[PDB]
Amino acid sequence: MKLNISYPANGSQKLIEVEDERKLRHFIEKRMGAEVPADPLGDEWKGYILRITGGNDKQGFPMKQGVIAPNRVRLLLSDGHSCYRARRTGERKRKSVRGCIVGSDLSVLALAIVKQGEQDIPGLTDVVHPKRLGPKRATKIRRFFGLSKDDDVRKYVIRREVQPKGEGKKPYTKAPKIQRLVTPQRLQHKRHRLALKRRQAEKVKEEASEYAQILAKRIAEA
Amino acid sequence: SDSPVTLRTRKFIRNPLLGRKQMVVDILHPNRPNISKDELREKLATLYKATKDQVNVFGLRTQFGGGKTTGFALVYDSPEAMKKFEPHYRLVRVGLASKIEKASRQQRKQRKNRQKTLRGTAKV
Amino acid sequence: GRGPKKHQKRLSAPSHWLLDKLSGVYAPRPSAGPHKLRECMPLIVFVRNRLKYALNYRETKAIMMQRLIKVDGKVRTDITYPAGFMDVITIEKTGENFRLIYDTKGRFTVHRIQDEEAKYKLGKVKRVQLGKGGIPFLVTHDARTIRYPDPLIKVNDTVKINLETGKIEDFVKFDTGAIAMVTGGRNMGRVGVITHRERHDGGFNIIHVKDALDNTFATRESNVFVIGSEKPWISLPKGKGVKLSIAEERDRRRAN
RNA sequence: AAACUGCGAAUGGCUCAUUAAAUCAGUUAUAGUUUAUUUGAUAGUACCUUACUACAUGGAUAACCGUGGUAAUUCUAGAGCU
RNA sequence: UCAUAAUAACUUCUCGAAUCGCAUGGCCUUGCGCUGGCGAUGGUUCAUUCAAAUUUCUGCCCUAUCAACUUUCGACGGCUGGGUCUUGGCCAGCCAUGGUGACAACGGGUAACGGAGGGUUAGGGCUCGACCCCGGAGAAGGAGCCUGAGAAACGGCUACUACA
Ligand SMILES: [Mg+2]
Ligand SMILES: [Mg+2]
Ligand SMILES: [Mg+2]
Ligand SMILES: [Mg+2]
Ligand SMILES: [Mg+2]
Ligand SMILES: [Mg+2]
Ligand SMILES: [Mg+2]
Ligand SMILES: [Mg+2]
Ligand SMILES: [Mg+2]
């Protein structure tokens, strides 16, 4: 009974296997998404609350949440379904799926830390993996560092040094080129759209004025 | 051979669209087998005051009984125009371009089909 | 499944293209635009099978999208753009303009125009209705939409449209005594004078055309194209739209 | 490069099993209809919703990092971004 | 009862550009102020193009040891509606008893895909046409369906039968 514990805050991942099921007994009748204390898993897990996120049975079939069945079922999946990767536009496929009710006849179960305890498990809380920075949208940069409407977002960009190909050259940094930022090009494009829109405006009205002129002179001579 | 090689040009036209001149070349070469593509090129170049790299010829079919060959000759205004316009197979045979070495057709297709079973950066 | 075709067979290609039968299995297929496909003329055929510049598919494709061929003054990068009737083809690299006009044999010829005939086109009025806002509009044979035509252009008239603004210089009314060219049927490429117009309710009215040799003919107004009111407004190809029999054609060769 | 997005994959090629007013052929109609693409034109509107902004709105998801399952598939899950 | 215009309203209110590249130029209230082209993609309506889909008239080999066939449960028609991109017994309700046939209907056979055409003939004909082109249908045998402008698609999916 291998357990895949995840720590969303620190981004830590480790697998630990439990050979005695009596520490898993309180997990048998639970369901995906249920927050369960991990007291039997202790005593290093006292004061720890775990959330069920799914698991794989002994045949490797994943758990699709929302299927209320302790056994395996066959479903017709589609693009947006949670255990199918459609390789064609509109293609649907029938695949074997394990139900959301966890229990016996299972190989690996996925866990997540909900509430921190007063312990230090080697591999979960001891390591704080840095978040893969970073934001790319202009407003997301603005809200992240608390800028204002008149601040220069152009300079508040996360850096990351890169080592060249062992040539002993000076290292430089990459940047997340910011999208949805105001440029004179965008303003010029907005200016051009109105410029093209206005140009059509007189052209139709002068032709309408012109066509009225011929009709005016045609009726006069007629 | 002792007898001179006589050059002739018909259907001559100036084509600035590809920056070249198109014509059909006729050869009168009695008492000799034929003329090579190479020695044909300098003779055209010296006749048109161009260089060897200015001149390319397509295909020489000797007329029945010998003594005459006909073909399509191409001379360019600038060497850059030839390199940009002349097809790669023509460049490799005349010698100023390197052949694009690649695997066999079936092996490349088999190489591609194995890629379809892989996803992401695991392909490379 | 079922859908539109994308290939064309060389044997089933239009005859007037004068395509080599043994060159390959397929033939160029026009995409869309200045149609009908029967008849039209692809740009590749015009530049490769009539000018050889452009010897095969690769070179003509390079020429097309080097932006050097102006159809009616407009850049076309389509290798198989359907060049059609009265269309003006321009090659500024060599400095000349071509126009597509049928000859007596019924096939497009390489007709040349020097400097000023490339500034306009004759088009046949196919539709006159009221536009989206009660605005009268006119449709020509080359899909050109004109948003403000003269009120006296009813049907089948030929309008001289300017080739850099689209404006109409002048129009010719469809009536007897006008110079007409037969653009369809058995009498392709024949230029004459309209003499009689008999009306048959049912959509198959007949037009009688008289040639320069006092020859009487008949055609529908689906193939009658008006060229001039008193004299042709364009330059005709050699022969001036007069068809000669097999004997006189041979005699012209023996004399010349 | 990988991956997301768009397009194509309804073309072509093969065969003649079914099929006897059926297919098909010539000739008609769509005033009884749809139409990606191409081509030419073509849209000014104080209409009313968000905390508000037009010098510019919001939330997700890949690729990627790391943890796996099954003997096995162009199977996929849990977790952190963007 | 067309094109088109106008009025009274309506909508799980469509479209009316929060997209990208090059050139970067002009003006005066000098403000990081106002303006400026070429393109790329995309967008409503109309026309057009490639078309598709139905549709009118006429024309198919042998057989009576096939003479009556269709109509309960659509067969011929009328009406109202639904469904379709649209017409239509296409379908749902109500009414009437019609429709085809000795000028061969209906049924059966084809070792029958149709045609342009091949062979051979003085004329009149006989015979072949799976097959380089046009149209139709199919993807082991039926049915159903998603995406999509376009498929009842099969080098798409789902189910059953056979095979594996
Ligand atoms: Mg099919
Ligand atoms: Mg076309
Ligand atoms: Mg096909
Ligand atoms: Mg339009
Ligand atoms: Mg009825
Ligand atoms: Mg009805
Ligand atoms: Mg059969
Ligand atoms: Mg057979
Ligand atoms: Mg299906």
- C35 appears as a binding residue in the annotation: yes
Give distance CA C130 / C1' E56 (Å). 32
C150 interaction partners in chain A (CB closer than 8 Å): 214
Q: Which nucleotides of E are covered by protein (CB under 7 A)?
A: 3-5, 17, 19-24, 32, 35-39, 45-53, 132-135, 146-154, 156-159
Consecutive H or E run containing A3: strand A2-7
Strand order in the sheet with C74-75: C74-75, C69-71, C88-91, C96-99, C111-113
**Helix, strand, coil percentages in chain A from 3-state DSSP, rounded to 5:** 25, 25, 50
Residue C83 CA, distance from chain mean position: 8
Q: How far apart are CA C64 and CA C89, in angstroms?
A: 12
C170, C173, C178, C182 alpha-carbon torsion, rounded to 10°: 100
Phi/psi of residue A12, nearest 5 degrees: -105, 145
Q: How far apart are CA A162 and CA A164, in angstroms?
A: 6
| Partners of residue A15 on adjacent β-strands | A4
Neighbours of chain C (3+ CB pairs under 8 A): A, B
Phi/psi of residue C250, nearest 5 degrees: -65, -40
Phi/psi of residue A187, nearest 5 degrees: -65, -40
Query: Does B85 contact C at CB distance below 8 Å?
Result: yes
Q: Which residues 6+ apart lie within 8 Å of A147 measured at CB?
A: A141, A153, A156
| Strand residue runs (E) in C85-205 | 88-91, 96-99, 111-113, 120-130, 136-140, 145-146, 158-162, 168-172, 179-182, 190-198
Give distance CA C12 / C1' E113 (Å). 22
Whether B17 sits inside 8 A of C54 (CB atoms) is yes
Q: What tokens appear for C98 in the block?
A: 């071509």
Q: How far apart are CA C41 and CA C47, in angstroms?
A: 11
Q: Which nucleotides of D are covered by protein (CB under 7 A)?
A: 1-3, 8-13, 28-29, 36-44, 55-59, 63-70, 72-82
Please check whether residue C123 is in contact with residue C86, taking contact to mean a CB–CB distance below 8 angstroms.
yes
Terminal-residue alpha carbon distance, chain C: 58
Whether B87 sits inside 8 A of C62 (CB atoms) is no
User: Do β-strands B61-62 and B6-15 pair in parallel, antiparallel, or remain unpaired?
Assistant: unpaired
Other C-beta atoms within 10 Å of A160: how many? 11
Q: Which of residues 10-29 of C touch strand E (CB under 7 A)?
A: 11-12, 25
Pinpoint the alpha helices (H) of chain C.
Answer: 43-48, 57-64, 246-255
Residue C17 CA, distance from chain mean position: 14
Instruction: Give strand letter and number of the nucleotide nearest C25 (CA to C1').
Output: E132
Query: Does A211 contact C at CB distance below 8 Å?
Result: yes
Between the CA of residue A160 and those of A127, A135, A179, C66, C138, what are the distances in Å?
21, 13, 19, 43, 63
SS3 labels along B70-114: EEEEEEECCHHHHHHHCCHHHHHHHCCCCCCCCCCHHHHHHHHHH
Instruction: Indicate the residue type of A143.
Output: R
Residue A172 CA, distance from chain mean position: 29
Between the CA of residue B114 and those of A88, A186, B62, B119, C32, what are the distances in Å?
19, 44, 48, 11, 40
User: Do β-strands A106-115 and A2-7 pair in parallel, antiparallel, or remain unpaired?
Assistant: parallel
Q: What tokens appear for A16 in the block?
A: 């630990």
Computed on alpha carbons and rounded to an integer, the radius of gyration of chain A in Å comes to 31
Q: How many residues are there in chain A? A: 222
Between the CA of residue C166 and those of A64, C229, C241, what are the distances in Å?
64, 21, 28
Please check whether residue B79 is in contact with residue B92, taking contact to mean a CB–CB distance below 8 angstroms.
no
Burial of A7 (0-12, 13-18, 19+ CB in 10 A): buried
Phi/psi of residue A112, nearest 5 degrees: -145, 140
SS3 labels along C10-74: CCCCCHHHCCCCCCCCECCCCCCCCCCCCCCEEHHHHHHCCCCCCCCHHHHHHHHCCCCEEECCE
Please tell me the distance in Å from C228's CA to the nearest CA on chain A.
24
B16 interaction partners in chain C (CB closer than 8 Å): 93-94
- C31 appears as a binding residue in the annotation: yes
Consecutive H or E run containing A200: helix A184-221
DSSP state letter for A57: E
Whether A215 sits inside 8 A of C151 (CB atoms) is yes
Please check whether residue C62 is in contact with residue C21, taking contact to mean a CB–CB distance below 8 angstroms.
no
Q: How far apart are CA A200 and CA A75, in angstroms?
A: 56
Phi/psi of residue B103, nearest 5 degrees: -70, 180
Q: Which of C163, C164, C153 is nearest to C125 (CA)?
A: C153
CB environment C143-178: b (16+ within 10 A), e (fewer):
ebebebbbeebeebbbbbbebeeeebeebbebeeeb
